[PDB]
Every structure is written in C-alpha cells, then in structure tokens.
Design a protein around this ligand. Structure first.
Ligand SMILES: *[C@@H]1O[C@H](CO)[C@@H](O)[C@H](O)[C@H]1NC(C)=O
Ligand SMILES: *[C@@H]1O[C@H](CO)[C@@H](O)[C@H](O)[C@H]1NC(C)=O
Length: 43
C-alpha cells in the first residue's frame, strides 16, 4: 500500500475520525460503496 493507507483494519468510521475518511474512500480499505463507478480525478 501507499504512504496514505495501511491495511483493511478500517480505523476511521469507528470513532477514529470525525466520522470522516479520505484515502479509505479511494478503494483502499474496501468500505466505500457506490452505484456507478466513481474513483476518478480531474487530473
Ligand atoms: C471531529 O472534527 C471536529 C471538528 O469538525 C472536532 O471538533 C472533533 O474533536 C473531531 N473529533 C474527532 C474524533 O476527531
Ligand atoms: C497527473 O496528476 C497526477 C496526480 O494527480 C500525477 O501523478 C501525474 O504525473 C499527472 N500526469 C500528467 C500527465 O500530468
């Protein structure tokens, strides 16, 4: 994994954050869930 994530422990969401995440929603933990596809950037 990159220098942003760590594992699938799923820290945030369980009080670790203001229930708020970032890199996790980037399909790094497997918690995010959408109807379409997402996971894109305006690079
Ligand atoms: C969550 O963020 C709020 C500010 O938006 C802050 O006041 C609060 O202490 C934070 N809580 C945690 C667990 O990070
Ligand atoms: C596009 O931006 C990404 C970072 O979001 C960067 O890693 C990549 O090198 C950039 N590619 C080009 C062609 O600018």
């Amino acid at each position: 994994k990159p220098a942003w994530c760590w594992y699938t422990l799923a820290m945030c969401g369980a009080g670790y954050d203001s229930g708020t995440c970032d890199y996790m929603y980037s399909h790094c933990f497997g918690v995010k869930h959408s109807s379409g596809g997402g996971g894109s950037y305006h690079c």
